[PDB]
Amino acid sequence: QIDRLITGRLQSLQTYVTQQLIRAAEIRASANLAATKMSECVLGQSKRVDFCGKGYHLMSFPQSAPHGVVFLHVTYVPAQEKNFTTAPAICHDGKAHFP
Amino acid sequence: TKCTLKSFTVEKGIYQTSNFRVQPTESIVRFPNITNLCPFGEVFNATRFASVYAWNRKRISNCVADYSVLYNSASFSTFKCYGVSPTKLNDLCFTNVYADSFVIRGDEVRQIAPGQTGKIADYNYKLPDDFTGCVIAWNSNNLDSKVGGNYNYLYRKPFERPLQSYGFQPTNGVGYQPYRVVVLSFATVCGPKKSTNLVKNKCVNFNFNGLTGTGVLTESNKKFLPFQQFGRDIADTTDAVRDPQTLEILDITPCSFGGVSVITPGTNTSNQVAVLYQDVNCTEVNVFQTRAGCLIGAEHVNNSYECDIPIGAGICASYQTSQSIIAYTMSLGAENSVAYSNNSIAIPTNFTISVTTEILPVSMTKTSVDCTMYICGDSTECSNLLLQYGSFCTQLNRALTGIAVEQDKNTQEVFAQVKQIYKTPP
Amino acid sequence: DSTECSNLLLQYGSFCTQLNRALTGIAVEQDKNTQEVFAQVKQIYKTPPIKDFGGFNFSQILPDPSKSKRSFIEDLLFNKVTFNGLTVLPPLLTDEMIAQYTSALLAGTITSGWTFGAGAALQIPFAMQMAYRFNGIGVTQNVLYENQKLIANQFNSAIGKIQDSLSSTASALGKLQDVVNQNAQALNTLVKQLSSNFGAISSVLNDILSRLDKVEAEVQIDRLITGRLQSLQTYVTQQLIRAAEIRASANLAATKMSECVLGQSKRVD
Amino acid sequence: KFNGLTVLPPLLTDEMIAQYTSALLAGTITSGWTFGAGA
Amino acid sequence: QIDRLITGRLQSLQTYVTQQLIRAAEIRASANLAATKMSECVLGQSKRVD
Amino acid sequence: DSTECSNLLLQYGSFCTQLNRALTGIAVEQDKNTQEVFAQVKQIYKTPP
Amino acid sequence: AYTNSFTRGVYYPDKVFRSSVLHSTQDLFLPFFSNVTWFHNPVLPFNDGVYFASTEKSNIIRGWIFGTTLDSKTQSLLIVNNATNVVIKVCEFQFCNDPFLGVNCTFEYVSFKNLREFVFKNIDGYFKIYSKHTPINLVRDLPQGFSALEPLVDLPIGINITRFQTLLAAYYVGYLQPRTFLLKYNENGTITDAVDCALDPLSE
Ligand SMILES: *[C@@H]1O[C@H](CO)[C@@H](O)[C@H](O)[C@H]1NC(C)=O
Ligand SMILES: *[C@@H]1O[C@H](CO)[C@@H](O)[C@H](O)[C@H]1NC(C)=O
Ligand SMILES: *[C@@H]1O[C@H](CO)[C@@H](O)[C@H](O)[C@H]1NC(C)=O
Numbered sequence A: 001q002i003d004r005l006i007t008g009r010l011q012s013l014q015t016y017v018t019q020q021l022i023r024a025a026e027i028r029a030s031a032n033l034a035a036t037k038m039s040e041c042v043l044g045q046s047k048r049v050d051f052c053g054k055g056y057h058l059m060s061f062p063q064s065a066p067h068g069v070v071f072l073h074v075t076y077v078p079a080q081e082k083n084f085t086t087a088p089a090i091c092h093d094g095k096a097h098f099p
Numbered sequence B: 001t002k003c004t005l006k007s008f009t010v011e012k013g014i015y016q017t018s019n020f021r022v023q024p025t026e027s028i029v030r031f032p033n034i035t036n037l038c039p040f041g042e043v044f045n046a047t048r049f050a051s052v053y054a055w056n057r058k059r060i061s062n063c064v065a066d067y068s069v070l071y072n073s074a075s076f077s078t079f080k081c082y083g084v085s086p087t088k089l090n091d092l093c094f095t096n097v098y099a100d101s102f103v104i105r106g107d108e109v110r111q112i113a114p115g116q117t118g119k120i121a122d123y124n125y126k127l128p129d130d131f132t133g134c135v136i137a138w139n140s141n142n143l144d145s146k147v148g149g150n151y152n153y154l155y156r157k158p159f160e161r162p163l164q165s166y167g168f169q170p171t172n173g174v175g176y177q178p179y180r181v182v183v184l185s186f187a188t189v190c191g192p193k194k195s196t197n198l199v200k201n202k203c204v205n206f207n208f209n210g211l212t213g214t215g216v217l218t219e220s221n222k223k224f225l226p227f228q229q230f231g232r233d234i235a236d237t238t239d240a241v242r243d244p245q246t247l248e249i250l251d252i253t254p255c256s257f258g259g260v261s262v263i264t265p266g267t268n269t270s271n272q273v274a275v276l277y278q279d280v281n282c283t284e285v286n287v288f289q290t291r292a293g294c295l296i297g298a299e300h301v302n303n304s305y306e307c308d309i310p311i312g313a314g315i316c317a318s319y320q321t322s323q324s325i326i327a328y329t330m331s332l333g334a335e336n337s338v339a340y341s342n343n344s345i346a347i348p349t350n351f352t353i354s355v356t357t358e359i360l361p362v363s364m365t366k367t368s369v370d371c372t373m374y375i376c377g378d379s380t381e382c383s384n385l386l387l388q389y390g391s392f393c394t395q396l397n398r399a400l401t402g403i404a405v406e407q408d409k410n411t412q413e414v415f416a417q418v419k420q421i422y423k424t425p426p
Numbered sequence C: 001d002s003t004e005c006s007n008l009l010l011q012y013g014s015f016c017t018q019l020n021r022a023l024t025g026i027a028v029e030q031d032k033n034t035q036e037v038f039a040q041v042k043q044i045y046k047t048p049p050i051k052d053f054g055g056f057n058f059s060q061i062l063p064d065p066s067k068s069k070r071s072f073i074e075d076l077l078f079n080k081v082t083f084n085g086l087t088v089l090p091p092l093l094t095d096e097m098i099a100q101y102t103s104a105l106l107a108g109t110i111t112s113g114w115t116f117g118a119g120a121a122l123q124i125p126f127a128m129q130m131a132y133r134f135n136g137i138g139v140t141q142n143v144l145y146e147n148q149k150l151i152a153n154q155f156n157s158a159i160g161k162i163q164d165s166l167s168s169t170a171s172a173l174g175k176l177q178d179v180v181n182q183n184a185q186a187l188n189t190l191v192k193q194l195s196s197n198f199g200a201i202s203s204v205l206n207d208i209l210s211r212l213d214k215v216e217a218e219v220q221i222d223r224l225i226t227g228r229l230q231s232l233q234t235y236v237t238q239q240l241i242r243a244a245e246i247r248a249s250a251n252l253a254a255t256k257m258s259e260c261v262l263g264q265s266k267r268v269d
Numbered sequence D: 001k002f003n004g005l006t007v008l009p010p011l012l013t014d015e016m017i018a019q020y021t022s023a024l025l026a027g028t029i030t031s032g033w034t035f036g037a038g039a
Numbered sequence E: 001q002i003d004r005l006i007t008g009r010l011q012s013l014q015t016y017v018t019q020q021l022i023r024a025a026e027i028r029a030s031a032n033l034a035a036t037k038m039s040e041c042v043l044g045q046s047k048r049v050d
Numbered sequence F: 001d002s003t004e005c006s007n008l009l010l011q012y013g014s015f016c017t018q019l020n021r022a023l024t025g026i027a028v029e030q031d032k033n034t035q036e037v038f039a040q041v042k043q044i045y046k047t048p049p
Numbered sequence G: 001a002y003t004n005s006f007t008r009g010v011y012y013p014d015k016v017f018r019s020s021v022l023h024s025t026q027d028l029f030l031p032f033f034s035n036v037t038w039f040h041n042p043v044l045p046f047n048d049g050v051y052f053a054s055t056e057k058s059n060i061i062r063g064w065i066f067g068t069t070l071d072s073k074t075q076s077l078l079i080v081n082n083a084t085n086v087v088i089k090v091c092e093f094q095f096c097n098d099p100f101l102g103v104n105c106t107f108e109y110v111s112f113k114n115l116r117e118f119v120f121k122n123i124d125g126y127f128k129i130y131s132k133h134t135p136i137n138l139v140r141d142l143p144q145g146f147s148a149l150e151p152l153v154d155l156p157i158g159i160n161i162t163r164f165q166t167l168l169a170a171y172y173v174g175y176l177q178p179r180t181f182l183l184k185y186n187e188n189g190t191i192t193d194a195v196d197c198a199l200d201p202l203s204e
């Protein structure tokens, strides 16, 4: 009888530890990502588009949270616009000028 | 759904709760056209028998045991069974099928008992000391015996003659009068496998020969070779069969089944729900058909909205305006024709700062399990048995400790990138 | 659907329910992965009727109403990749919705540069979007304009070579084809394992129940339950590991969408 | 809950995490990116 | 008797192969990171702080 | 390498083949990891003397 | 004398239809390119079961006997083609030691221009017979090609077999072995090619 309970409880606990190894690898992927967000967007200013929130990145502030982290990504977002006529270059004394 | 989640409150979502599974509507049995029956009339309609001092014994093998005909033969002068019964023996089978017969007086019921006794039994017509099967007798004194009698008597092992034959006559009393004794006993010979009519396009229970199952039998175009009986799919599951009574090939398609999933707004907001029968065709079950299955109790809405509760294949559901559950094709976002041309640019005159929150997990709950206490708490008896499995509890507790130390590493990897605890200015 | 087996499986408790929960997590992960890659654009931008992109020719990669709406190259790609209680489930986004996002992303990328990630899409002529991408690699933009048709001819020609590279061999799509084959191989392995005996008298469940009286059949069926259940735990463990491997690829593809389509990543290689 | 299952505390307390997020934040405000790249 | 040893050894070997699959994902995550460092940090100059 | 044991191990079916296949998957992937990391270069460059 | 068996002697392993599929089984088969003994008769061993074939046009090769003694002492198979069809008996035949057709008992039954091919195997108490027929060009040996043998009869007779012999113009004998095979079933449910997995490293 006890061989059945041991084999069952042990197969059940191996299932739990297998779940937790795979879940821990998912949380490590998220912790390495969070570490990277912190190095690039708190300690720096990232040029990686949409890596630190939508908009062009300015800075970010970390805040702690239970079992995790929150970033407040401060981003410049352009917000009103005008249509204009444009040209890639302009002539002057036969020479082409570029911006 | 409440019982599925073991909770009275249910959050907004879609939940699998049961299997829809069409039940067999009736049961089908099919075997070859019944043929090569046992010629039991070679004993049970014989004109006479050899005397009990020389009683006959024979095989009864390589033929189908038509015992249902002898079971209806209530006009038999006598009948009995001991190793079986006549209600089951017409469906039973014999491993080495056999029969016996003799001419004897009506007192020979004493010769039918295992380790038989009396003059015919002591002569040769006796039953085995550990006998089996069934016994019969036929009315010889009615017409097989003339008024002068016949050699249907004997006096002192099965069918072994220390013995001699004698006369008996139809003018005698019922125990002295002659009768035609018969026996049958225990592959060699099996009773007839009865068949039903065949039924198509319904979910049905079936057996073909010994190939049992349940399925939707449909006529099919496939070309079996004449010796082939069953088809299989690529994964070796049976896909078709040959019928044993006409040369038809039937696809055994499955009986319809799928997950029942319940769409609900949160129970804090409503107690109305809508049910998705996964990959069912609605005729089999408001009602709405989708590529994901049959959706019941959701109103189909022809407009499109952002996806509230996801159903699948572009369908989503929500609770909306008197309110009810609706289902709709999801919006991907509003359309926008960007006003491109070879000489036009849009430059922004103004901006907004935005402060986009982003949220990330960094650690699990650090956990450890004493596998000796979990598997065997307080029991020395169980703890000793756990040691027969060797390294497993050591390996489990090691693996969890690996995760546990990794959580502190994760937390330091994120926050501890800074060498000094900078105070603010005042 | 054998009741005699089904009662014995209840004695193993929550194993079935946590296997179904584990697989249901993997099902949600696929809709989530597909959302995070493609749904990076809030509005379905749509292609202009005029096509005067300074000489560049996207006609192979833009939509086609005669093709579902998939582009010519998306039709090549869709051609070259190719009941025992198991069920497949549909994606949340059908291929006709994925095609609307890859159209929106592409029509944003063509008409408006990186700007449609940073905010509203701002139109800019394509010959100017390339100047402000040459400056992004330290080539002075006059090196575009003095070579505009030469650069266009190389781009259009290279797009033509991708049609040939994909039309001639499926070997470039080997990753996608392998991902499909691995799943089919896991499912075939899981189905074939129903035929294995696991030390029981037969692998046909009704055959056991025909040969034997209940207390003998119980032990024989308990072996089949143990074997099939261990085969399920194996399959689900393997699919969880495989799902993490695909999710890592989905996070990378989502990052290539964000940096590499919606921008100009300076990350070498 | 007594069945050999145990939850273990984190090495850093939440107050120590709040000192690191304070340090990171006070660095970020007073000194920009410079506190990552050395002094 | 041998079926107990097969049951035990097979479950033990499945534990080992399950563990090695998870470990190979940890190593492949490190190899993809290492290849990314070689592409961005050796073959080029990276502005990605730390 | 017992025949009397292997005849029982066959009754467990595909487990042994998918273990050999899983470990062969690990094995090939190491040669890939090493070529992903180091084989980023089309030619074997050499310094001046 | 001996000749090469080539890819011949494959037979339908079970009464099952399968289509467009590369099914595989371990069963008693004649190994690919095995030595088949050539003959133009002595009592032969039966071993793991027999492949037998004859290049024939006179139909003078006419019957087979099987058993342990294959004569007098015990119930022994007698199989004859009698110009109606196959005829079968299993009596304890104390008959003539080398019969020719004119130029106790427990069971009984009734059913060069060519190569006619056969397989005889004994499993669990069933006796199995298979066959195939073809026209031919080659006279000294089996023609190099592929064509699977089909079941004829399937007899529950339970008799022991360790020897066989043939009754009275050229024929071939080989022995089955517990080989594993890969079998190519086509769209129409016929075996059309095979691999003897044990043959060479490419076959594995
Ligand atoms: C730019 O001009 C076009 C008409 O030429 C118009 O459709 C588009 O909406 C305008 N955009 C803005 C931002 O005004
Ligand atoms: C089965 O489903 C299809 C759509 O997938 C539908 O057209 C058809 O009418 C349904 N069949 C029946 C018998 O209801
Ligand atoms: C820019 O936007 C702000 C509101 O965000 C507005 O008060 C300000 O006047 C705008 N500037 C111009 C030049 O329009």
Ligand SMILES: *[C@@H]1O[C@H](CO)[C@@H](O)[C@H](O)[C@H]1NC(C)=O
Pocket: C051, C057, C059, C060
């Ligand atoms: C674009 O290229 C395709 C072939 O690649 C051709 O059919 C089409 O005419 C071209 N259009 C322009 C504007 O170059």
Ligand SMILES: *[C@@H]1O[C@H](CO)[C@@H](O)[C@H](O)[C@H]1NC(C)=O
Pocket: G082, G083, G084, G085, G087, G110
């Ligand atoms: C073949 O055998 C049967 C009995 O088994 C017999 O009736 C028939 O006449 C025989 N054939 C010839 C051509 O004699």
